[PDB]
Amino acid sequence: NLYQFKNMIQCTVPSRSWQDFADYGCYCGKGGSGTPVDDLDRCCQVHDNCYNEAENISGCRPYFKTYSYECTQGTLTCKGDNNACAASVCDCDRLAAICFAGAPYNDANYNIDLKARCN
Ligand SMILES: CC(=O)Oc1ccccc1C(=O)O
Numbered sequence: 362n363l364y365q366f367k368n369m370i371q372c373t374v375p376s377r378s379w380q381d382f383a384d385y386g387c388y389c390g391k392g393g394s395g396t397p398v399d400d401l402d403r404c405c406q407v408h409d410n411c412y413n414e415a416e417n418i419s420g421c422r423p424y425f426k427t428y429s430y431e432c433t434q435g436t437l438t439c440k441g442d443n444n445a446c447a448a449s450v451c452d453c454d455r456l457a458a459i460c461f462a463g464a465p466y467n468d469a470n471y472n473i474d475l476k477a478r479c480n
C-alpha cells in the first residue's frame with residue numbers, strides 16, 4: 362500500500378523527504394501521462410505501468426494492498442508470504458524505491474504544470 366511505499370522510500374533515500382517524490386515530473390505522484398522529463402520521472406513511469414499491470418489481477422488494488430516486506434541494514438526485501446497480488450505490488454514498489462535512489466533529483470522538475478507539459 363502507499364503507506365508501505367512511502368516507508369520503502371524513507372528507507373532507500375533517507376536524505377530526502379518522501380514528499381519530494383510525491384509531485385515530480387509527469388509521472389511521480391498524481392500525473393500519469395506524456396513524455397518522462399528525466400531519469401527519475403522514468404522510474405515513476407515504469408512504476409505506474411507496473412501498477413496498471415497488477416490491477417489486471419482479480420481483486421488486486423495496488424494503492425491499498427498490504428504486502429509483507431522488510432527494510433533492514435540497507436536492504437529491501439519482499440517476503441515469501443505474499444500472494445500473487447501482494448508479490449507483484451511489493452516488487453513494483455521495491456524496484457521503484459531502488460530506482461529513485463540511483464536517479465538524479467532536479468529541483469526544476471518538482472511540481473511542474475501537468476496540463477501544459479505532460480500531454
Ligand atoms: C500520488 C500517489 O498516490 O502515489 C505516489 C507516491 C509517491 C511517488 C509516486 C506516486 C505515484 O502514484 O506515482
Ligand SMILES: [Ca+2]
Binds near residue numbers: 391
Ligand atoms: Ca503516477
